[PDB]
Design a protein around this ligand. Structure first.
Ligand SMILES: Nc1ncnc2c1ncn2[C@@H]1O[C@H](COP(=O)(O)OP(=O)(O)OP(=O)(O)O)[C@@H](O)[C@H]1O
Lengths: 213, 222
């Protein structure tokens, strides 16, 4: 439970405007004009975007603006660009030398057309087999929207366990990638004629196969 | 050239202690009030503590008061946080953050580090095994080839991966980790390269797992 309340998510299309709200009370957002907003890309240091409700640091583009009405502050991004996809956190002085924050809003930039996945399937390495383990690695790339399911087969039989699949996340080129792993014993790997990884994306499937031989 | 870099994040047992560091450069450190702010996984930011330029004005959030101690050494351009009596809910990325110039930027963190991950758990540290994902005549899309590294069975997060020491970035994607039922993580990284380069260029994935003091430089060959 964050001290300030923000919608978990917001979205818009390139060139559009999006507004993100931040609800506090009179002990913080409504008690002072010390409201700040920070931008955070994944794995990066947060960056100051807005301070004292509506002021912009040098170097923040003018399409970011801030306002507040009573106990609620708002960040508006005009002319949305793909790079604005990020998490945004509001903040306020709260008295008693305290600074409080919101829970974050993930801003998604939409309008991307459909893109089909590519699938790359790797067999276990010699080194892993010598460690008495075997992991097949199925890498799925370059797709949009970011939703897939992954099915594994031993020969033609759907596997009964040992699968771990990641949630899709963005590539550098703004399409999605995901990964899936099939854990086997070396004996299982060597005793079937082939294994397959099949990805389902928007009603279509791509399947790759590998063989120990 | 304002720079902040945190260090010291690690696995620590419930009830244990840990000490974080932050090195600053590119500004007049001994005139700034410095802060620790944290972000629990999937949660929002949480300010923890501030220390003035002379270390004589110190404030703590309720959530850490009596457990964490902030301090600084202006001669080393460094800030510290001594964490005691740690609990699972103290698991978070810990950020060093500069308060802006007083009067102009009151209650604003105008510069931040990238943060260091602290994991509070009774589990044990485990370094990764790194396996090659070799390109083959069934891993090629004609003029380009995909190759990768599998980073198996480590704990806690995080692992970092680069290719050829950062000289290769265009064809690179490093995937998020899976958490397996063993309680251990695995991840993979992949890069696309010219098929013709497979005979001439060496491809190396550089894997770092700081909690286990492990560095692996794994050659990925055909
Ligand atoms: N951006 C800021 N926002 C909120 N409080 C701040 C900020 N910058 C400094 N402070 C606070 O201002 C107070 C003064 O700290 P400072 O480091 O200026 O020591 P000082 O001895 O008063 O300074 P001086 O040597 O200039 O007289 C401390 O309470 C500190 O927490």
């Amino acid at each position: 439970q964050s001290a300030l309340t923000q919608p978990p998510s917001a979205s818009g299309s390139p060139g559009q405007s999006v507004t993100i709200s931040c609800t506090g009370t009179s002990s913080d957002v409504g008690g002072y004009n010390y409201v700040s907003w920070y931008q955070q890309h994944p794995g990066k240091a947060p960056k100051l975007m807005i301070y004292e409700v509506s002021k912009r640091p040098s170097g923040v583009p003018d399409r970011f603006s801030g306002s507040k009405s009573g106990n609620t502050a708002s960040l508006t991004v005009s002319g949305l660009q793909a790079e604005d996809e990020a998490d945004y956190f509001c903040s306020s002085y709260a008295g008693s030398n305290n600074v409080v924050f919101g829970g974050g809003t993930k801003l998604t930039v939409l309008g991307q057309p459909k893109a089909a996945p590519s699938v790359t399937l790797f067999p276990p390495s010699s080194e892993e087999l010598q460690a008495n383990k075997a992991t097949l690695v199925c890498l799925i790339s370059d797709f949009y929207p970011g939703a897939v399911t992954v099915a594994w087969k031993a020969d033609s039989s759907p596997v009964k366990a040992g699968v771990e699949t990641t949630t899709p996340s963005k590539q550098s080129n703004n399409k999605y990638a995901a990964s899936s792993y099939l854990s086997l014993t070396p004996e299982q790997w060597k005793s079937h004629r082939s294994y397959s990884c099949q990805v389902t994306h928007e009603g279509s499937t791509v399947e790759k196969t590998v063989a120990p031989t | 050239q304002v720079q902040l870099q945190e260090s010291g994040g690690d696995l620590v047992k419930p009830g244990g202690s840990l000490r974080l560091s932050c090195a600053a450069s590119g500004f007049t450190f001994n005139t700034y009030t410095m802060n620790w702010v944290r972000q629990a996984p999937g949660k929002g930011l949480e300010w923890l503590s501030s220390i003035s330029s002379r270390s004589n004005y110190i404030n703590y959030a309720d959530s850490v008061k009596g457990r964490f101690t902030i301090s600084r050494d202006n001669a080393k351009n460094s800030l510290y946080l001594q964490m005691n009596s740690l609990r699972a809910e103290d698991t978070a990325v810990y950020y060093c953050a500069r308060f802006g110039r007083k009067g102009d930027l009151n209650w604003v963190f105008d510069y931040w580090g990238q943060g260091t991950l602290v994991t509070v758990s009774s589990a044990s540290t485990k370094g990764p095994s790194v396996f090659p994902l070799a390109p083959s005549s069934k891993s090629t899309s004609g003029g380009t080839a995909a190759l990768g590294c599998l980073v198996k069975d480590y704990f806690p997060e995080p692992v970092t991966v680069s290719w050829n020491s950062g000289a290769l970035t265009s064809g690179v994607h490093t995937f998020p980790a899976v958490l397996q039922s063993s309680g251990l993580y695995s991840l993979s990284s992949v890069v696309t390269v010219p098929s013709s380069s497979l005979g001439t260029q060496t491809y190396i994935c550089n894997v770092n797992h700081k909690p286990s003091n492990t560095k692996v430089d794994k050659k990925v060959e055909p």
